[PDB]
Write a protein that binds this ligand. Structure first.
Ligand SMILES: Nc1nc2c(ncn2[C@@H]2O[C@H](COP(=O)(O)OP(=O)(O)OP(=O)(O)O)[C@@H](O)[C@H]2O)c(=O)[nH]1
Ligand SMILES: Nc1nc2c(ncn2[C@@H]2O[C@H](COP(=O)(O)OP(=O)(O)OP(=O)(O)O)[C@@H](O)[C@H]2O)c(=O)[nH]1
Ligand SMILES: Nc1nc2c(ncn2[C@@H]2O[C@H](COP(=O)(O)OP(=O)(O)O)[C@@H](O)[C@H]2O)c(=O)[nH]1
Ligand SMILES: Nc1nc2c(ncn2[C@@H]2O[C@H](COP(=O)(O)OP(=O)(O)O)[C@@H](O)[C@H]2O)c(=O)[nH]1
Ligand SMILES: [Mg+2]
Ligand SMILES: [Mg+2]
Lengths: 52, 431, 51, 50, 437, 431, 437
């Protein structure tokens, strides 16, 4: 897992790509920008953005 | 909405076109009845390239099936996936010579050409884009070469702007199986030079070589040779049918291989090809695909590529790939064997990566070579022809229907100019 | 049918127990801090009135 | 010896040729600019003027 | 106000545009069906989408792009894909016959039947636009529609519009890696055409991007999707000054004025820093000095071109995120004390920096990591003359024996445009020589 | 990611390599199908040294099986754990030489060598960080001696830097098993001296003695014989596969054990080895492991290190032990038995401790000794060679399919030079 | 401001570094994921970790270490072990083929493949250093990458830097216990770079550490883990003065200018006290006078050479914990009147005292006791000539008939290197003999 990556073999967890699947349909899935559920994680201290 | 109208001429044409139609019908999900049973919208979105919808939701191949004698066409109607064809585009003659280019091109071929031309006009006017024409004939016979070259001449005179490729199964020294093969090939190669845009020359002894050493099979029969030819045929139009990262249709392939109008005699190949007992023991990758294509024992033409120089190589890869391995494998091949590539054209590789592999294979590739080593078959056929023509043997069978020996001399001379042109563009340096 | 869909999210049975254990330990840790602050506020409510 | 040790031979014994399993630290850290990205609180207001 | 019109031409253009508009929708919070999330909010202004998206009034955020190709494959792939209700169906334009990697076919036979309709759509978009900042034409110099019809569209747009800027994002062929044999012909013809009708021509290679994805993002097997995501990051960092607000801002009109000295040298290089995966991102500080050094590293350019074999002329650096203007000219001072990075003598001040406080947007399921600071470098070095000379040598090898020239003569061209492009390219070499000396 | 290519030559090499591959598949948790059914991540930690990931989850061994006649490869394929091998890695010819060095090296071995070299080239190209080659064969045969030494030579000019290991089953002092065995042994070690990096000399007489006086076992069987040799083979390459406290690969062993370029014939030894009636009477501890490891009866060759002198010693331990007591035992063995160690080299025992023992054992050790005692074996083969060569016994073939007496003369001279070198470095003084 | 970069080269170097960094993490309260749970630190204030760790700004603490091996193994064990998240991915540099106990392999052929990676990583760690103070380098003389590549890296490091302090913690070969064969060859081939590229070099013997673990720690089953734990405690006691606060304290410059009299005489004895188990610390008082007396014992040194056969040239004591300078003065008065310890006549005062009030910390699963006080005694002494004499006897014994020289000669090394390195070590012995008469 800590080697140089392969998106094709890392598609579908680790079992490789799907039958009759094209690159644009697999990659450009139109997923929304995820908002992390950091309830169990420990968020580091805020450093402030450029607006601050 | 590009499309190709297909033509089968002769017994070999009607066999290796039948196998081509059933393998692409399997790729497109078409039943032997004709009703779709696939799983993806990609499998129908570009089905208009080869099929016509009919009333009742059934797809018909856009093919014209021509033979002088109607035994092979009864066989192709009887074969599996044989009932998808229309019965209108089944053109037959009552008589018919066979293994006689004069009596396939001049006599009993001058009146059946009107019927096949009418069918071609019908199938071409039933179109909106009409990318082009695909003839799957074979040199050596009468109606394969004579009627086939007459069809190519008529089509080139009618539509001289559409892409139009012939395949041809050009004669071999060892398998032979016909006395008049040098005459039949010599009388048709100059017509192919003048008219055909892409000639994908296949050879029977090379197909037997593949099914003997590459994949074992212990009895290659005839269906496996046709399946190799059919997979090679399907690997060229996979950019026309299925989408991919980098696309190349027939016109792009013609532009990016042929440098000059007369040098359009490609030699094809296919990868992967494994034995049935060692298919699960192989790591199928793009580098190993390149290993298999760039090899003398894999090419489906009888020429050894090491005996000349590559002008251009087309690699039509199929599958979920990374473009960097494709580019670096082609460049490593060129940089290693740079002596076998012409130096006045840098980077002699056209690359087309499609996203849909053929069924049963995860990672496939189709090879096309414009090698200058293709002149060995032409020199061989020329010396066989001049051996049979130095004393005029089997010549009354050709001159009984108005053909002159000056036609034979002109065909031999033009074939010699083709050989000399290939020699010149092999030995030419960046002066 | 069932449909092959991989699995993605699925926890080991000792990870499932460790999710509920660390929720209880985090809630107990914040409960004793409130109990520490309750004794602070109660104590200063007597001293400030006395001062 | 008892011949039932032949049937007891196929028992699962505690495999220990690879030593004790090393404990792994959970990935319970995330930077603030990655944890709180794209998170905006929207409200509505009056702002009355005279 | 402050809007630009995107023109994605070619298969490379359409795929780059897919990546670009996915990044733009994720940056502005627009859903793939062109709607706001309503219950979720993305934050940031009221008109910080109008550069790329025009509002219908019912909430439909239709973009400002024209995807055009002479092939129904790559564009119907978009029409079938998840962004099927985002684009107006008249924006996505397909021909019937392919250009077949032929500049003559794409410029004289097949381009003319579709050029009228694509300029009609461009006229409709520009009439919708209040005041246009410019066009962004995404294509490839390799061949076909991106070298032919694209140059035709540039000529017609320069005739019809004039003073409006036409920025290019050109996928220029690698010195060694290429996927076609007529690429020197197509590149020299399209460059001779765009040398007289362009204002700026941002070059992005492919072998260099393979090097970036291999060394930096440690992807040993990269596809075109990662390359297009990097190019999308380049163009997003370019136009973030127009889109958001903050510190020092530069617009696309005078990007050129602070970039190109003479109206011949308009081929700037590209660089992005940082380009790091999610593993080697939270273990580094990512300071402004570090990202400026990462921009100035020779094995970090977006084009296969060593910047040490030539002098710099202008460097426009666009910083994004937690960037204070103290650190920018703290790092530029160290760059100027460095003597291996040697600037041209007639340009004492050769930096134009623009700081926006908006960090870059990370795509879900992508390869780049969420970094607090980033910088996109646009260098105008003289070192690209090596690539020009390699193109000239390849053209000489191919044109010495007139290989693949009947394909261009028989579909519209005369046999004089090849020699004209060649002497124009040699003139470009000599202009670079007199600029350097 | 260091990896070696295994190469079995002769019928002895084929059986011993099948035994080695099945026991290493048992060590790495590979089923006879070819998939993985183990219980730890350390088995796939370094699975690439011996196995290749076929697309489909199968692990194919990186082995080349060579035989002149398709004999024992049929047994290998039809036995258990024989389906893992790729069927393209079996190389055979239509004839079969058998116990003839000249036929196995010049007539029949010269036809198969191109195919074997092609297969080995393919395996080394499949490698990316190749460590070297490990060939198992027997001295006293036609394919094991002749074809094996031909392969060793050819791969020596192919890869002049990779580490070359040979596991050679050497003739026993008693019981012949072949009458041209001194001829084959001399004529093969003439190549083994100057073409191998390290050679492990193994003989059935000492292995049978181990099986009786150490393991009792009543009926030894070549399965257990090849099991003992394969256990040594697995022990010698342990640090390449599993993490440890002191790593030592084959290059490390060669550097620390080969003082002079000709002196590289070792005596292998594996010594967790207890009779089944005495498992209840021993404690598996490091001092007892060291004692049985340095015992002369445990040696897998018939030569006596008590009669000779230890130049260098390599001890590779497996298991979670201490380092201090291992080092203390290696120092203590020399400090007591200082008459069997040459004193011009101080502390001539190398230690390589790995964490993971083999399955079913608390700890393990393997012993590789470069004594000067091995000159007795070459003296035996030399006088058994000259007793035949002084009366031209069995020489009519070796003159028939193409050698001179000069080759036998040079082989005998090289063997006697090796004997003289071993003697001079045995009796050389400290100062 | 201060930092200390630690390089760990070789299998022995990486195995020292594992225990070193677990001890540093437990000293600074850093969890293996890479952040502190609390903010204030017991003893030192706030930035007491800058000598070893660096802030990413977001709360991640990345060590200032470079773990280098010419081998996938061991460094992959670190990369897949407990501390897989603490270490930056690019500061663990691995090769492909091991040097196989060959100085020629490690120095001439395969070292010059990642010597530039480790140098670039060193430069990038030094760029994050505000004021850099140390280059603590950990390796062994057993051979391979710990000798040849350590020599190559030390040579390039000393020509690049040189105003810094390059300290060595070398695993010198023990007089009779050794795990390899060509150890004298490798040690003599690498002793030149310890002579003329090192500011100081502390060399230990594995059997000396074995003996002190067997006697003092009561471990009849000692292991390399215990050896690395003791060596890590020694290095922590050396470097605690930079990070933690306390009384009169010595940084590396003061230490190495009060330790070495001459540039070629920089090879001191190492001793730690009280090396003690917990069930024996229940019985011992562990007072300042008795731990100083335990430091002045023949069977307590890290290297097997009896100090009664030489003259103590200088001693630097670093005390930690409940230590008072009054108690130190009493202990020094006790030592200076002992007839067993004698000094050179040209060193009237021969003690340099550093004090910290931070006691050493213990690791779970460890072997040392939680002592209230400790002392590291580092003494430049002429009695180390025994080790060089034994090594030269071994090397001459093997080199009398040219054993194993063909490996080095064929692996790109001239045969005169052995002779000239032997001459250099003979000169070093001559200096150490007639420096103290
Ligand atoms: N970076 C990047 N380059 C691409 C991509 N797709 C194609 N290219 C480049 O485009 C070049 C070939 O020209 P194309 O863009 O495919 O041709 P076209 O512009 O679509 O015109 P046609 O030849 O008619 O298809 C190749 O050399 C590629 O380097 C892509 O997705 N990303
Ligand atoms: N104190 C201590 N010494 C060690 C340790 N590991 C190895 N050594 C020493 O290292 C010497 C051998 O060199 P290695 O470190 O194993 O090898 P290397 O430096 O990685 O170089 P290569 O031989 O190419 O692998 C032995 O003599 C040991 O004394 C350890 O964990 N602790
Ligand atoms: N591939 C293929 N080759 C054939 C077939 N029949 C004949 N040939 C070869 O081609 C030559 C004759 O071609 P033929 O098929 O008779 O041509 P046709 O009469 O026009 O159909 C012979 O020498 C054969 O070697 C066939 O069915 N398939
Ligand atoms: N240990 C062991 N030795 C074997 C085995 N098979 C053959 N041999 C030895 O090999 C010698 C015969 O050589 P042979 O194998 O016939 O050589 P080949 O003809 O080249 O294959 C005999 O002395 C046997 O002792 C085996 O399975 N195990
Ligand atoms: Mg296209
Ligand atoms: Mg090592």
């Amino acid at each position: 897992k800590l080697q140089a990556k392969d998106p094709v073999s890392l598609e579908n967890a680790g079992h490789g790509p799907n039958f009759m699947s094209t690159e644009a349909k697999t990659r450009f899935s139109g997923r929304p920008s995820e908002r992390k559920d950091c309830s169990t994680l420990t968020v580091g201290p805020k450093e402030g953005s450029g607006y601050t | 909405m590009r499309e190709i109208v297909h033509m089968q001429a002769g017994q070999c044409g009607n066999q290796i076109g039948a196998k081509f139609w059933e393998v692409i019908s399997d790729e497109h999900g078409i039943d032997p009845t004709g009703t779709y049973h696939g799983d993806s919208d990609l499998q129908l979105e570009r089905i208009n390239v080869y099929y016509n919808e009919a009333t009742g939701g059934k797809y018909v191949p856009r093919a014209v099936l021509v033979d002088l004698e109607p035994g092979t066409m009864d066989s192709v109607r009887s074969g599996p996936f044989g009932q998808i064809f229309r019965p209108d585009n089944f053109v037959f003659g009552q008589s018919g010579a066979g293994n006689n280019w004069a009596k396939g091109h001049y006599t009993e071929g001058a009146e059946l050409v009107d019927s096949v031309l009418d069918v071609v006009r019908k199938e071409a006017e039933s179109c909106d884009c009409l990318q082009g024409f695909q003839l799957t004939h074979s040199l050596g016979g009468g109606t394969g070469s004579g009627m086939g070259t007459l069809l190519i001449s008529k089509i080139r005179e009618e539509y001289p702007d559409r892409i139009m490729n012939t395949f041809s199964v050009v004669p071999s020294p060892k398998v032979s199986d016909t006395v008049v093969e040098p005459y039949n090939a010599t009388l048709s190669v100059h017509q192919l030079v003048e008219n055909t845009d892409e000639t994908y020359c296949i050879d029977n002894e090379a197909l037997y070589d593949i099914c003997f050493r590459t994949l074992k099979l212990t009895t290659p029969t005839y269906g496996d040779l046709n399946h190799l030819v059919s997979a090679t045929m399907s690997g060229v139009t996979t950019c026309l049918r299925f989408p991919g990262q980098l696309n190349a249709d027939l016109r792009k392939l013609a532009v990016n291989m042929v440098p000059f109008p007369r040098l359009h005699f490609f030699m094809p190949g296919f990868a992967p090809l494994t034995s049935r007992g060692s298919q699960q023991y192989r790591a199928l990758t793009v580098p190993e695909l390149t290993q298999q294509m760039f090899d003398a024992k894999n090419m489906m033409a009888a020429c050894d590529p090491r005996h000349g120089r590559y002008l251009t190589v087309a690699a039509i890869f199929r599958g979920r790939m990374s473009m960097k391995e494709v580019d670096e494998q082609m460049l490593n091949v060129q940089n290693k064997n740079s002596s076998y590539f012409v130096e006045w054209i840098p980077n002699n590789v056209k690359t087309a990566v499609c996203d849909i592999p053929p069924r049963g294979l995860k990672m496939s590739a189709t090879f096309i070579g414009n090698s200058t080593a293709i002149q060995e078959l032409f020199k061989r056929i020329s010396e066989q022809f001049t051996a049979m023509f130095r004393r005029k043997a089997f010549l009354h069978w050709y001159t009984g229907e108005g053909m002159d020996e000056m036609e034979f001399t002109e065909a031999e001379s033009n074939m010699n100019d083709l050989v000399s042109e290939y020699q010149q563009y092999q030995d030419a340096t960046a002066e | 049918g069932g449909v092959a869909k991989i699995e993605t999210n699925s926890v080991t049975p000792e990870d499932w127990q460790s999710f509920s254990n660390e929720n209880i330990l985090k809630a107990e840790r914040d409960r004793k801090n409130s109990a520490d602050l309750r004794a602070v506020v109660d104590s200063l409510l007597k001293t400030t009135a006395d001062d | 010896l008892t011949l039932s040790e032949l049937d007891e031979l196929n028992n699962k014994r505690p495999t220990l040729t690879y030593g004790q399993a090393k404990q792994a630290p959970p990935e319970d850290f995330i930077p603030a600019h990655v944890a709180f990205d794209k998170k905006v609180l929207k409200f509505n207001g009056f702002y009355k003027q005279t | 106000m402050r809007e630009c019109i995107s023109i994605h031409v070619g298969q490379a253009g359409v795929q780059i545009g897919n990546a670009c508009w996915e990044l733009y929708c994720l940056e502005h919070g627009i859903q793939p069906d062109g709607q706001m999330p309503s219950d979720k909010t993305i934050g940031g202004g009221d008109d910080s989408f109008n550069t790329f998206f025009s509002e219908t009034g019912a909430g439909k955020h239709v973009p400002r792009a024209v995807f055009v190709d002479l092939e129904p494959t790559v564009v119907d792939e978009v029409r079938t894909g998840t962004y099927r209700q985002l684009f107006h169906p008249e924006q996505l334009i397909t021909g019937k016959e392919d250009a077949a990697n032929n500049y003559a076919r794409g410029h004289y036979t097949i381009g003319k039947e579709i050029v009228d309709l694509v300029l009609d759509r461009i006229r409709k978009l520009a009439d919708q636009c209040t005041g246009l900042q410019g066009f962004l034409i995404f294509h490839s110099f390799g061949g076909g529609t991106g070298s032919g019809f694209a140059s035709l569209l540039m000529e017609r747009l320069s005739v019809d519009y004039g003073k409006k800027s036409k920025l290019e994002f050109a996928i220029y062929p690698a010195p060694q890696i290429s996927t076609a044999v007529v690429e020197p012909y197509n590149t020299i013809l399209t460059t001779h055409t765009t040398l007289e009708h362009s204002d700026c021509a941002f070059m992005v290679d492919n072998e260099a991007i393979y090097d970036i994805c291999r060394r930096n993002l440690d992807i040993e097997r990269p596809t075109y999707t990662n390359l297009n995501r990097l190019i999308a990051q380049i163009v997003s960092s370019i136009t973030a000054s127009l889109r958001f607000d903050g510190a020092l801002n530069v617009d696309l009109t005078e990007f050129q004025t602070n970039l190109v000295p003479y109206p011949r040298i308009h081929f700037p290089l590209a660089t992005y820093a940082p380009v790091i995966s999610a593993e080697k991102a939270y273990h580094e500080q990512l300071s402004v000095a570090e990202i400026t050094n990462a921009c100035f590293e020779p094995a970090n350019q977006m084009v296969k071109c060593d910047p040490r074999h030539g002098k710099y002329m202008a460097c426009c650096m666009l910083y994004r995120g937690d960037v204070v203007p103290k650190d920018v000219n703290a790092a530029i001072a160290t760059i100027k004390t460095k003597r291996t990075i040697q600037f041209v003598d007639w340009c004492p001040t050769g930096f134009k920096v623009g700081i926006n406080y908006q960090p870059p947007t990370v795509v879900p399921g992508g390869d780049l990591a969420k970094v607090q600071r980033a910088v996109c470098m646009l260098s105008n070095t003289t070192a690209i003359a090596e690539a020009w000379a390699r193109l000239d040598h390849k053209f000489d090898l191919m044109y010495a024996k007139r290989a693949f020239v009947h394909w261009y003569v028989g579909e519209g061209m005369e046999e004089g445009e090849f020699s004209e492009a060649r002497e124009d390219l040699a003139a470009l070499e000599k202009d670079y020589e007199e600029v350097g000396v």
